[PDB]
Amino acid sequence: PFTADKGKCGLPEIFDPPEELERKVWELARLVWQSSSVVFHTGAGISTASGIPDFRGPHGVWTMEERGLAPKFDTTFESARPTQTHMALVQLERVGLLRFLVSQNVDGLHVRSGFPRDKLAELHGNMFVEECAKCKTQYVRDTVVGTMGLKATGRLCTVACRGELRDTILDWEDSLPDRDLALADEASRNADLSITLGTSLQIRPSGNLPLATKRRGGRLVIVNLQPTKHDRHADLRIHGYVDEVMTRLMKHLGLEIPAWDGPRVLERALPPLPRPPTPKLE
Ligand SMILES: Nc1ncnc2c1ncn2[C@@H]1O[C@H](COP(=O)(O)OP(=O)(O)OC[C@H]2O[C@H](O)[C@H](O)[C@@H]2O)[C@@H](O)[C@H]1O
Numbered sequence: 411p412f413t414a415d416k417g418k419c420g421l422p423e424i425f426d427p428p429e430e431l432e433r434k435v436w437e438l439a440r441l442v443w444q445s446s447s448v449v450f451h452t453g454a455g456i457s458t459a460s461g462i463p464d465f466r467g468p469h470g471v472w473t474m475e476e477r478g479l480a481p482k483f484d485t486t487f488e489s490a491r492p493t494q495t496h497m498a499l500v501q502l503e504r505v506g507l508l509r510f511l512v513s514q515n516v517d518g519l520h521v522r523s524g525f526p527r528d529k530l531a532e533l534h535g536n537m538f539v540e541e542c543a544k545c546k547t548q549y550v551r552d553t554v555v556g557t558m559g560l561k562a563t564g565r566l567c568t569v570a571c572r573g574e575l576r577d578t579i580l581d582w583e584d585s586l587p588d589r590d591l592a593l594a595d596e597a598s599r600n601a602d603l604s605i606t607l608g609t610s611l612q613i614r615p616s617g618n619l620p621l622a623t624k625r626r627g628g629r630l631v632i633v634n635l636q637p638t639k640h641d642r643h644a645d646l647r648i649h650g651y652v653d654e655v656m657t658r659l660m661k662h663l664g665l666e667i668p669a670w671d672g673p674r675v676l677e678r679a680l681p682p683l684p685r686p687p688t689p690k691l692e
Pocket residue numbers: 452453454455456458459464465466467470514515516534607608609610611612613633634635636637650651652653
């Protein structure tokens with residue numbers, strides 16, 4: 411825990427120049443158009459523009475710790491707004507261009523953005539979610555569950571049980587939730603395109619799942635300001651702010667980024683909404 415490997419921290423940022431960035435976001439659009447099964451992989455980089463620091467960025471939690479400084483929050487977890495990137499991912503699932511969403515983030519923003527939980531794997535847990543030890547019934551709360559490391563929160567199960575409710579926040583020693591990891595692995599294996607957004611891919615097995623897409627000829631796109639463990643295996647690397655990338659991508663796809671109405675929980679995905687017809691590519 412104290413000694414836990416926190417990985418490569420504070421690597422230099424890379425910025426694709428505008429012309430190279432415009433061309434690569436068009437190539438990503440082309441790949442999304444050509445792909446039957448698109449899986450997105452998200453980490454802490456997608457929440458930095460909402461005031462939540464990442465782990466391994468220049469001002470990341472672990473980076474700052476290494477230099478004896480503190481991470482800085484410009485929001486509480488409760489007052490944090492889903493980013494343009496969060497809301498882009500809601501719309502991409504709604505129009506049938508996103509098959510599955512695998513996230514290492516505990517910030518609860520995917521769930522609160524209105525993203526359907528049956529298409530989301532929260533590999534590291536969710537600050538807002540507590541789970542009954544006895545019946546496994548999960549509860550999505552409007553405030554952070556006040557503990558971490560899978561401890562008793564103090565509340566009891568209300569299913570018509572009184573079981574001990576525990577937080578879902580994995581400590582260093584904890585196995586990933588079997589249900590989320592199995593569905594994430596199946597989604598990544600079956601994918602013909604895996605897009606990583608604001609993750610350095612340094613944590614096993616989370617960071618390895620996008621590689622699973624590469625088996626059987628699938629494509630891998632990595633979007634990130636810093637290098638990532640698997641840059642080598644990427645068909646496409648985009649070095650820019652994930653919000654700039656996703657807003658340009660949505661524009662190329664003819665999709666609007668929907669308004670956020672405040673925190674809303676959607677359990678199950680609907681049939682896809684209408685989407686624009688596809689360009690002639692080849
Ligand atoms: N706006 C942005 N646009 C693009 N990239 C960004 C942006 N902001 C940050 N980044 C990049 O986003 C990347 C985020 O990388 P890391 O900080 O390792 O976070 P993880 O989600 O992969 O951490 C994995 C687990 O490790 C922890 O212990 C927890 O358990 C985590 O769940 C960096 O390379 C930034 O350059």
